[PDB]
């Protein structure tokens, strides 16, 4: 016959097309709500500093929950305790980068590899542009470039991370499923820095590049990708 | 107005020089055919700078233009006229060579049969 | 609406509504 068998094919096709359209409206409004949340997160740490200075007290802001490590010293001649920490940070090649949340279990790992990494507190623009330009994904333990939202949504759908700004929100606003969202991300293959390093061997305090350079990691990121 | 092939891509070759075997210039007893030297102090084996280069795998041509003659075809060594019917349909890709041993009387039958079957022969005038 | 199990009648209803 192929009369109703024909039409139910395009019934099912139209059904999944409308399903895809409802999903796109979903992630549109999720991105809008995120933009509102980031406006509030930026303005409230100005608001509360102002209300502290208005009384004459001081407002200590919260210690940040998210750093971005970069491996600035190469393979050769690495002490093994410094080596295993880098393997758990997934900084294997030179000039790889990884988002890392902070706590006492992680800062004492980062100080073991302080001569070899440069790390600081990455800005919202940094967490955006790293994902969009250099952000890939460990899909089926392969390395597939994040070209469409389905590559994110098939791997991270059960953590309710189904577009790319969901991934950006989970990385930046460090969420509940940060471990899974970050271990989804392949380590960032950042290029050698344009302009050039100050000094590879010594710490940032003593005029170098190794170690914690807190707000200044963004200047490094902008010229490394 | 010869038998032009199907497609003729740009046959890019990575290296055009031969691999001279190390110190084949220095002696006559040493042919230029490459032998990877297995010495313990050798400048070539441990890849010094400005030395005789070694034939790694990365020098291999791409599989789409491997074994390909500069006219775009691939050769096929043909002994008798009975084997040109094998290239009757592999025509726009694979061309025919007549072997060195074949008589001047038997080259003419092969060349005329190839002219019928539209097969390029690399050496069509090998005896005249 | 957007997830396919429970939002099926809602997507069908908005499909009827977009005419």
């Amino acid at each position: 016959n192929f009369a109703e068998l024909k039409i139910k094919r395009l019934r099912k096709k139209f059904a999944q097309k409308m399903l895809r359209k409802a999903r796109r409206k979903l992630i549109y409004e999720k991105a809008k709500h995120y933009h509102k949340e980031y406006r509030q997160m930026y303005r409230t740490e100005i608001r509360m500093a102002r209300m502290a200075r208005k009384a004459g007290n001081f407002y200590v802001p919260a210690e940040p929950k998210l750093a971005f490590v970069i491996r600035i010293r190469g393979i050769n001649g690495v002490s093994p305790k410094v080596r295993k920490v880098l393997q758990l940070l997934r900084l294997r090649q030179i000039f790889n980068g990884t988002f890392v949340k902070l706590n006492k279990a992680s800062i004492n790992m980062l100080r073991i590899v302080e001569p070899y990494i440069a790390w600081g507190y990455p800005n919202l623009k940094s967490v955006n542009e790293l994902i969009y330009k250099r952000g890939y994904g460990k899909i089926n333990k392969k390395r597939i470039a994040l070209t469409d939202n389905t590559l994110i949504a098939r791997s991270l759908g059960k953590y309710n991370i189904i577009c790319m700004e969901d991934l950006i929100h989970e990385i930046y606003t460090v969420g509940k499923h940060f471990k899974e969202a970050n271990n989804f991300l392949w380590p960032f293959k950042l290029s050698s820095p344009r302009g050039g390093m100050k000094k590879k061997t010594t710490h940032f305090v003593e005029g170098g590049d190794a170690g914690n350079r807190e707000d200044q990691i963004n200047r490094l990121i902008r010229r490394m990708n | 107005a010869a038998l032009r092939p199907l497609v003729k891509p740009k046959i890019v070759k990575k290296r055009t020089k031969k691999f001279i075997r190390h110190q084949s210039d220095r002696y006559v007893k040493i042919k230029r055919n490459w032998r990877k030297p297995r010495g313990i102090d050798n400048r070539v084996r441990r890849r010094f700078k400005g030395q005789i280069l070694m034939p790694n795998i990365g020098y291999g041509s791409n599989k789409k233009t491997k074994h390909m003659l500069p006219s775009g075809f691939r050769k096929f060594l043909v002994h008798n006229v009975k084997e040109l019917e094998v290239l009757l349909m592999c025509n726009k890709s694979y061309c025919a060579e007549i072997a060195h041993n074949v008589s001047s009387k038997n080259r003419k039958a092969i060349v005329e049969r190839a002219a019928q079957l539209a097969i390029r022969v690399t050496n069509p005038n090998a005896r005249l | 609406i957007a997830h396919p199990k429970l939002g099926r009648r809602a997507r069908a209803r908005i499909a009827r509504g977009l005419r």
Binding site: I27, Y132, A145, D148, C163 | - | -
Partner: protein, 51 residues
Amino acid sequence: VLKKNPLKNLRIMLKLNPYAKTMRRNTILRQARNHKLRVERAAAALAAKSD
């Protein structure tokens, strides 16, 4: 697939993020509007300096 760059290529950025379109529409309208406001205040300042 060839990875095109969402920070340069517009419709790949929209493909990953359709709200980037209305952010960029609103911010281009705001760029032009604040620009015209500053040009109008500069013309008013020049008129007040003449007067």
